[PDB]
Every structure is written in C-alpha cells, then in structure tokens.
Amino acid sequence: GVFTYESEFTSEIPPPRLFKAFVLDADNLVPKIAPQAIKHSEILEGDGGPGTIKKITFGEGSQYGYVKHKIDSIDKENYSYSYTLIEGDALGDTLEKISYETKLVASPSGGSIIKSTSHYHTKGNVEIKEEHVKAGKEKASNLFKLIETYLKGHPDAYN
C-alpha cells in the first residue's frame, strides 16, 4: 500500500551549506533560487523543527498552487532531513499521507553526495501512477541542482 522511491546523486557544493539552506532556510531557499517554481514559504506550526507544518506555494498553473509539509526529522550532524506532506494537488484523492526523506554526505572527490527518498500512503485501496511519482523524481533532481547552484553562485546565502 505504501510506495518507496529514492534518488542518489552528488554536488560540487558542501552539504552543510545546502543543509542550512534547504532546512534551516527552506522558507528562504526556494523563494531565493527560483520564484518560478514556488510563490513563497510560510511555516504554519512549529518553527522549522519536527512537528512544524510548512505551507509551500506554487506560482505555476492558472489555479492556485501550494502544499503543506510536516517536518519529520533531520540530522544536523549528518546533514539529513525528512518531512511528511499532507497536501498537494498532485496527491489527489488517491494519496493521503506522504513521507519525504533526504540525506547529505561528502565524496572522496571533494564534492558532496546527496541521497533522497520518498514514500506514499494511499487511502481507500488506491495506488499512484508512475507518471506521478516518476515526475517527482525529475522535479526533485532539478531542485537538488538548484540548491547546490544557489550556494555555489550565492556565497552570501547563509554561507
């Protein structure tokens, strides 16, 4: 009933910089890298820790676009981050609880490795469509290169 998808890649930028950005600055990282993807981020509950509910908005699509992310846990010592999504026009009535996980590390070449993972919790005996989960893989990969490029080109972004 639960789907499991993961992605593995690396970046020439340090993970402690992309980490402070994606997590300690997610509300200011996405709205600073490319405003063409999200309109703005506003935390609804908590302050960025576990149990905090963030509301990311989208500036693409005639209809209003936005989602809600519930922090699940992070590893400021290992640079890992994981949250739970409960809203999103992509979840439709076929999906309900969403689980998102992300991990950061370093490589022997100086660059940094980035391991991500996500899951789906359908409700009512339903399943997701490859076109849906497969599209998230390409969207999550492009976002990873936007965070590393942001700090790589913006040495002032929480760096």
PDB file of C-alpha atoms in Angstrom:
ATOM      1  CA  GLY A   1       0.000   0.000   0.000  1.00  0.00           C
ATOM      2  CA  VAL A   2       2.998   2.317   0.506  1.00  0.00           C
ATOM      3  CA  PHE A   3       5.293   3.243  -2.406  1.00  0.00           C
ATOM      4  CA  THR A   4       9.078   3.592  -1.975  1.00  0.00           C
ATOM      5  CA  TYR A   5      11.149   5.813  -4.297  1.00  0.00           C
ATOM      6  CA  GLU A   6      14.731   7.027  -3.731  1.00  0.00           C
ATOM      7  CA  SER A   7      17.307   9.048  -5.700  1.00  0.00           C
ATOM      8  CA  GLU A   8      21.109   9.231  -5.351  1.00  0.00           C
ATOM      9  CA  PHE A   9      23.385  11.979  -6.723  1.00  0.00           C
ATOM     10  CA  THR A  10      26.175  14.396  -5.731  1.00  0.00           C
ATOM     11  CA  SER A  11      27.063  18.108  -5.914  1.00  0.00           C
ATOM     12  CA  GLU A  12      30.246  20.224  -6.019  1.00  0.00           C
ATOM     13  CA  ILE A  13      28.779  22.279  -3.149  1.00  0.00           C
ATOM     14  CA  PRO A  14      29.183  21.380   0.527  1.00  0.00           C
ATOM     15  CA  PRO A  15      26.248  19.667   2.235  1.00  0.00           C
ATOM     16  CA  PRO A  16      26.421  21.837   5.404  1.00  0.00           C
ATOM     17  CA  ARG A  17      25.663  24.837   3.180  1.00  0.00           C
ATOM     18  CA  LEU A  18      22.820  23.214   1.250  1.00  0.00           C
ATOM     19  CA  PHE A  19      21.595  21.751   4.569  1.00  0.00           C
ATOM     20  CA  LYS A  20      21.377  25.079   6.400  1.00  0.00           C
ATOM     21  CA  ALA A  21      19.602  26.310   3.270  1.00  0.00           C
ATOM     22  CA  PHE A  22      17.135  23.513   2.484  1.00  0.00           C
ATOM     23  CA  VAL A  23      16.220  23.039   6.166  1.00  0.00           C
ATOM     24  CA  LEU A  24      17.422  25.971   8.309  1.00  0.00           C
ATOM     25  CA  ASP A  25      16.477  28.262   5.385  1.00  0.00           C
ATOM     26  CA  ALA A  26      13.904  26.322   3.327  1.00  0.00           C
ATOM     27  CA  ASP A  27      11.447  29.210   3.798  1.00  0.00           C
ATOM     28  CA  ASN A  28      14.095  31.458   2.206  1.00  0.00           C
ATOM     29  CA  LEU A  29      15.959  28.990  -0.045  1.00  0.00           C
ATOM     30  CA  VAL A  30      13.224  28.061  -2.543  1.00  0.00           C
ATOM     31  CA  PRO A  31      11.952  31.659  -2.719  1.00  0.00           C
ATOM     32  CA  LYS A  32      15.530  32.800  -3.479  1.00  0.00           C
ATOM     33  CA  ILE A  33      16.693  30.187  -6.008  1.00  0.00           C
ATOM     34  CA  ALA A  34      13.805  30.360  -8.492  1.00  0.00           C
ATOM     35  CA  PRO A  35      10.496  32.103  -7.812  1.00  0.00           C
ATOM     36  CA  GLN A  36       9.138  30.398 -10.956  1.00  0.00           C
ATOM     37  CA  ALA A  37       8.655  27.146  -9.016  1.00  0.00           C
ATOM     38  CA  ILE A  38       7.202  28.267  -5.670  1.00  0.00           C
ATOM     39  CA  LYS A  39       5.479  31.552  -4.740  1.00  0.00           C
ATOM     40  CA  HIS A  40       6.609  31.645  -1.091  1.00  0.00           C
ATOM     41  CA  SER A  41       7.028  29.500   2.051  1.00  0.00           C
ATOM     42  CA  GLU A  42       5.204  30.229   5.332  1.00  0.00           C
ATOM     43  CA  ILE A  43       5.541  27.927   8.367  1.00  0.00           C
ATOM     44  CA  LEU A  44       2.112  27.268   9.930  1.00  0.00           C
ATOM     45  CA  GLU A  45       3.078  25.305  13.060  1.00  0.00           C
ATOM     46  CA  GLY A  46       6.395  24.882  14.913  1.00  0.00           C
ATOM     47  CA  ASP A  47       9.467  26.908  13.880  1.00  0.00           C
ATOM     48  CA  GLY A  48      11.294  24.584  11.454  1.00  0.00           C
ATOM     49  CA  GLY A  49      11.804  21.625  13.819  1.00  0.00           C
ATOM     50  CA  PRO A  50       9.974  18.298  13.974  1.00  0.00           C
ATOM     51  CA  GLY A  51       6.172  18.660  14.097  1.00  0.00           C
ATOM     52  CA  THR A  52       6.339  22.009  12.255  1.00  0.00           C
ATOM     53  CA  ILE A  53       3.887  22.372   9.346  1.00  0.00           C
ATOM     54  CA  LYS A  54       5.167  24.471   6.431  1.00  0.00           C
ATOM     55  CA  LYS A  55       2.920  25.720   3.602  1.00  0.00           C
ATOM     56  CA  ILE A  56       4.851  25.995   0.315  1.00  0.00           C
ATOM     57  CA  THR A  57       3.057  27.823  -2.526  1.00  0.00           C
ATOM     58  CA  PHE A  58       3.436  27.457  -6.310  1.00  0.00           C
ATOM     59  CA  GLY A  59       3.449  30.292  -8.874  1.00  0.00           C
ATOM     60  CA  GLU A  60       2.859  27.931 -11.826  1.00  0.00           C
ATOM     61  CA  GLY A  61      -0.610  26.864 -13.024  1.00  0.00           C
ATOM     62  CA  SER A  62      -3.731  29.003 -13.572  1.00  0.00           C
ATOM     63  CA  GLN A  63      -5.288  27.613 -10.368  1.00  0.00           C
ATOM     64  CA  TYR A  64      -3.660  28.420  -7.004  1.00  0.00           C
ATOM     65  CA  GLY A  65      -0.759  26.037  -6.310  1.00  0.00           C
ATOM     66  CA  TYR A  66       0.626  25.208  -2.852  1.00  0.00           C
ATOM     67  CA  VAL A  67       1.308  22.319  -0.452  1.00  0.00           C
ATOM     68  CA  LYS A  68       1.782  21.588   3.263  1.00  0.00           C
ATOM     69  CA  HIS A  69       4.951  19.930   4.623  1.00  0.00           C
ATOM     70  CA  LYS A  70       5.091  18.435   8.141  1.00  0.00           C
ATOM     71  CA  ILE A  71       8.697  18.191   9.379  1.00  0.00           C
ATOM     72  CA  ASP A  72       9.500  14.583  10.332  1.00  0.00           C
ATOM     73  CA  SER A  73      13.128  14.759  11.485  1.00  0.00           C
ATOM     74  CA  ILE A  74      16.605  15.967  10.468  1.00  0.00           C
ATOM     75  CA  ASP A  75      20.268  15.192  11.229  1.00  0.00           C
ATOM     76  CA  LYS A  76      22.166  18.485  11.665  1.00  0.00           C
ATOM     77  CA  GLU A  77      25.173  16.249  12.437  1.00  0.00           C
ATOM     78  CA  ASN A  78      24.835  14.045   9.336  1.00  0.00           C
ATOM     79  CA  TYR A  79      23.041  16.658   7.196  1.00  0.00           C
ATOM     80  CA  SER A  80      19.870  14.583   6.748  1.00  0.00           C
ATOM     81  CA  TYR A  81      16.282  15.882   6.514  1.00  0.00           C
ATOM     82  CA  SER A  82      12.867  14.183   6.314  1.00  0.00           C
ATOM     83  CA  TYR A  83       9.308  15.572   6.435  1.00  0.00           C
ATOM     84  CA  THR A  84       5.722  14.430   5.786  1.00  0.00           C
ATOM     85  CA  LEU A  85       3.486  16.009   3.120  1.00  0.00           C
ATOM     86  CA  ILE A  86      -0.287  16.099   3.730  1.00  0.00           C
ATOM     87  CA  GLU A  87      -1.444  18.496   0.983  1.00  0.00           C
ATOM     88  CA  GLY A  88      -0.775  18.926  -2.756  1.00  0.00           C
ATOM     89  CA  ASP A  89      -2.979  18.851  -5.878  1.00  0.00           C
ATOM     90  CA  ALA A  90      -0.679  16.009  -7.000  1.00  0.00           C
ATOM     91  CA  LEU A  91      -1.801  13.742  -4.135  1.00  0.00           C
ATOM     92  CA  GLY A  92      -5.404  13.938  -5.389  1.00  0.00           C
ATOM     93  CA  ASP A  93      -7.861  11.649  -3.563  1.00  0.00           C
ATOM     94  CA  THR A  94      -5.665   8.657  -4.485  1.00  0.00           C
ATOM     95  CA  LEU A  95      -2.936   9.519  -1.949  1.00  0.00           C
ATOM     96  CA  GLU A  96      -3.124  10.885   1.607  1.00  0.00           C
ATOM     97  CA  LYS A  97      -0.094  10.632   3.906  1.00  0.00           C
ATOM     98  CA  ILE A  98       3.231  11.377   2.188  1.00  0.00           C
ATOM     99  CA  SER A  99       6.683  10.684   3.608  1.00  0.00           C
ATOM    100  CA  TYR A 100       9.758  12.535   2.336  1.00  0.00           C
ATOM    101  CA  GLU A 101      13.366  11.849   3.401  1.00  0.00           C
ATOM    102  CA  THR A 102      16.722  13.352   2.367  1.00  0.00           C
ATOM    103  CA  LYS A 103      20.345  12.712   3.410  1.00  0.00           C
ATOM    104  CA  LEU A 104      23.617  14.551   2.676  1.00  0.00           C
ATOM    105  CA  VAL A 105      27.246  13.345   2.756  1.00  0.00           C
ATOM    106  CA  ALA A 106      30.700  14.001   1.258  1.00  0.00           C
ATOM    107  CA  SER A 107      32.680  12.249  -1.503  1.00  0.00           C
ATOM    108  CA  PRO A 108      36.359  11.377  -1.902  1.00  0.00           C
ATOM    109  CA  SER A 109      36.483  13.878  -4.793  1.00  0.00           C
ATOM    110  CA  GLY A 110      35.705  16.920  -2.611  1.00  0.00           C
ATOM    111  CA  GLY A 111      32.114  17.271  -3.860  1.00  0.00           C
ATOM    112  CA  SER A 112      29.211  16.127  -1.654  1.00  0.00           C
ATOM    113  CA  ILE A 113      26.791  13.212  -2.147  1.00  0.00           C
ATOM    114  CA  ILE A 114      23.024  13.687  -1.691  1.00  0.00           C
ATOM    115  CA  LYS A 115      20.715  10.705  -1.050  1.00  0.00           C
ATOM    116  CA  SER A 116      16.948  11.360  -1.123  1.00  0.00           C
ATOM    117  CA  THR A 117      13.909   9.114  -0.531  1.00  0.00           C
ATOM    118  CA  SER A 118      10.100   9.475  -0.527  1.00  0.00           C
ATOM    119  CA  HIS A 119       7.030   7.273   0.075  1.00  0.00           C
ATOM    120  CA  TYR A 120       3.243   7.354  -0.477  1.00  0.00           C
ATOM    121  CA  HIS A 121       0.318   6.302   1.760  1.00  0.00           C
ATOM    122  CA  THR A 122      -2.803   5.683  -0.356  1.00  0.00           C
ATOM    123  CA  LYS A 123      -6.190   5.549   1.406  1.00  0.00           C
ATOM    124  CA  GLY A 124      -9.305   3.644   0.272  1.00  0.00           C
ATOM    125  CA  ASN A 125      -7.475   0.909  -1.675  1.00  0.00           C
ATOM    126  CA  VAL A 126      -5.784   3.104  -4.312  1.00  0.00           C
ATOM    127  CA  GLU A 127      -2.331   3.411  -5.926  1.00  0.00           C
ATOM    128  CA  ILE A 128      -0.208   6.145  -7.551  1.00  0.00           C
ATOM    129  CA  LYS A 129       0.658   6.452 -11.259  1.00  0.00           C
ATOM    130  CA  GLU A 130       4.264   6.156 -12.492  1.00  0.00           C
ATOM    131  CA  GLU A 131       3.668   9.397 -14.426  1.00  0.00           C
ATOM    132  CA  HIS A 132       3.065  10.962 -10.992  1.00  0.00           C
ATOM    133  CA  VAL A 133       5.915   9.501  -8.915  1.00  0.00           C
ATOM    134  CA  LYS A 134       8.216   9.480 -11.967  1.00  0.00           C
ATOM    135  CA  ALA A 135       7.583  13.219 -12.442  1.00  0.00           C
ATOM    136  CA  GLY A 136       8.562  13.881  -8.808  1.00  0.00           C
ATOM    137  CA  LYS A 137      11.922  12.179  -9.449  1.00  0.00           C
ATOM    138  CA  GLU A 138      12.745  14.718 -12.179  1.00  0.00           C
ATOM    139  CA  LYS A 139      11.366  17.621 -10.117  1.00  0.00           C
ATOM    140  CA  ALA A 140      13.332  16.574  -7.012  1.00  0.00           C
ATOM    141  CA  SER A 141      16.530  16.151  -9.058  1.00  0.00           C
ATOM    142  CA  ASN A 142      16.283  19.635 -10.608  1.00  0.00           C
ATOM    143  CA  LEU A 143      15.655  21.160  -7.161  1.00  0.00           C
ATOM    144  CA  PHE A 144      18.805  19.475  -5.821  1.00  0.00           C
ATOM    145  CA  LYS A 145      20.912  21.155  -8.528  1.00  0.00           C
ATOM    146  CA  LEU A 146      19.199  24.477  -7.740  1.00  0.00           C
ATOM    147  CA  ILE A 147      20.170  24.394  -4.062  1.00  0.00           C
ATOM    148  CA  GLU A 148      23.789  23.465  -4.824  1.00  0.00           C
ATOM    149  CA  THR A 149      23.946  26.066  -7.626  1.00  0.00           C
ATOM    150  CA  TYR A 150      22.380  28.731  -5.380  1.00  0.00           C
ATOM    151  CA  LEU A 151      25.112  28.481  -2.725  1.00  0.00           C
ATOM    152  CA  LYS A 152      27.701  27.812  -5.456  1.00  0.00           C
ATOM    153  CA  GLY A 153      26.822  31.135  -7.111  1.00  0.00           C
ATOM    154  CA  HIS A 154      25.475  32.891  -3.994  1.00  0.00           C
ATOM    155  CA  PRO A 155      28.300  32.881  -1.448  1.00  0.00           C
ATOM    156  CA  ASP A 156      26.122  35.115   0.773  1.00  0.00           C
ATOM    157  CA  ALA A 157      23.184  32.694   1.081  1.00  0.00           C
ATOM    158  CA  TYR A 158      23.536  31.529   4.726  1.00  0.00           C
ATOM    159  CA  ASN A 159      27.086  30.650   3.634  1.00  0.00           C
TER     160      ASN A 159
END
